[PDB]
Design a protein around this ligand. Structure first.
Ligand SMILES: Cc1c([C@@H](C)NS(C)(=O)=O)cnn1C
Ligand SMILES: Cc1c([C@@H](C)NS(C)(=O)=O)cnn1C
Lengths: 264, 265
């Protein structure tokens, strides 16, 4: 991969692997989400990050995902080459945004798009905060200054408010636990695992007859390595579902989300 | 990736990804196992498969792993390029063997090696069978004829018989269940998930202070999508060795047995 000519975005090509695909021989949404993370990490490395900035390391601050929104038009098949372009933008004092565009390397057409909202947090107390001027200055140099949105449309699915699922849920998958492969290099549960857990409560018949077109996920709290999660789903409708991940015991919310599925 | 000059082996280079590494910023054994399977799949595709032969498709037969043996000297770091060479060999009527050699692309040194034993099975009845001459002639043209072993040593760990762990186990991890990401393109549990489940019963302090050097796994039965597994471990030993057992949480039916060897960091 490499930064583009202006140095304000990053591109990388990936060849879809045999273990990365599902029953239709196309990449799962989790493989797509892993690739978005990888191109994001490669972009941060290319522009000098060790994405904590110098000031963030001094004030013990980290970026945490608040929301992830993905829309897939075509899932790349096993052996296909997908090109992903990524960029970040400052959202004033609120936080930052990272966007992605997925393209078929052979045809050049857009096969998917994603957007994510990140907020600042003290890594020890876990308390959220706004973005200060000193931190905004050291990352503005890597962002386009004029707006560049993967989801430009005025009133699109990426900015919709998600309600809290009420008991009883129509479907559920209980007792979900992360294993070591679900952890990142800092021993935290990878954000992609939560996408997997959300999908676990969708019945197999829907998965077998539909393709996931849109997924919006809100992140409220982290699941620790010794935590146990319940995944809850209710049909709200194409089929649309409302989702909720909560701790098995006290019922503490960890995530909420929505999915939109198209008939094959 | 590509077949080598003689067309009897296959090589592929991989750049280690951010999500593929553990706490030390080096590839986990599961990432290594996934890469071994990807290079194996790319080798089968390059020589005309889609590794079911023409006669195998006619007799409804498939290759199934009986044993996997991996030895790692150095785990590649995040961003490093690892080159993996793979080849297959006929083992007469018993089955076939697939071997791998892992190398650091920059230094050229061997950083790991793996070997695996595969047996023929009827896809529907699940009954094992020997390799017929007709099937053997369809894949011998893709194998070196003279022996080529990743583990040549006359008394090596890859061919050791593994005993069955006796209750009570020293350590355990109960109620393990596969999710959709643990399934392959045919909706079967991926073989690499079993490596993960075996490792789950190793205490975190051993993982934090040791590096996994050798893993040998015997595959006895498949875990179905609605099955629940218990992972059991007992220390058998600067080096720590463990005996492992995966069994169904209910009836206690054996699915895998294995051994691991760990070295102090
Ligand atoms: C605290 C937290 C969040 C924030 C952004 N969600 S919240 C509480 O603001 O709704 C995301 N992950 N974690 C661990
Ligand atoms: C049935 C099976 C085996 C065989 C080789 N083990 S066995 C029958 O010899 O105990 C390996 N994986 N699976 C699913």
């Amino acid at each position: 991969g490499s930064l583009t000519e202006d140095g304000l975005s990053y591109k990388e090509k990936f060849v879809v692997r045999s273990y990365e695909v599902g029953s239709n021989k196309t990449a799962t949404v989790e493989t797509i989400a892993n690739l978005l993370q990888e191109v994001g990490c490669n972009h941060a490395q290319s522009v000098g990050f060790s994405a904590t900035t110098t000031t963030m390391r001094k004030l013990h601050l980290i970026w945490v995902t608040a929301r992830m929104h993905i829309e897939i038009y075509k899932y790349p098949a096993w052996g296909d080459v997908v090109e992903i372009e990524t960029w970040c933008q400052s959202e004033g004092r609120i936080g930052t945004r990272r966007d992605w565009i997925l393209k078929d390397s052979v045809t050049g057409e857009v096969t998917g798009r994603a957007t994510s909202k990140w907020v600042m947090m003290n890594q020890d107390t876990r308390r959220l905060q706004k973005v200060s001027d000193d931190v905004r200055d050291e990352y503005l140099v890597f962002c386009p200054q004029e707006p560049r949105l993967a989801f430009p449309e005025e009133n699109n699915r990426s900015l919709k408010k998600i309600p809290k699922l009420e008991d009883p849920a129509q479907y559920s998958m209980i007792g979900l636990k992360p294993r070591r492969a679900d952890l990142d290099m800092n021993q935290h549960v990878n954000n992609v695992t939560y996408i997997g857990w959300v999908l676990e409560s969708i019945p197999q018949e829907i998965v077998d007859t539909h393709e996931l077109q849109v997924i919006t996920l809100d992140y409220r709290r982290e699941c620790q390595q010794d935590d146990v999660v319940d995944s809850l789903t209710t049909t709200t409708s194409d089929s649309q579902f409302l989702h909720l991940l909560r701790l098995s015991g006290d019922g503490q919310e960890i995530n909420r989300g929505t999915t939109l599925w198209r008939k094959k």
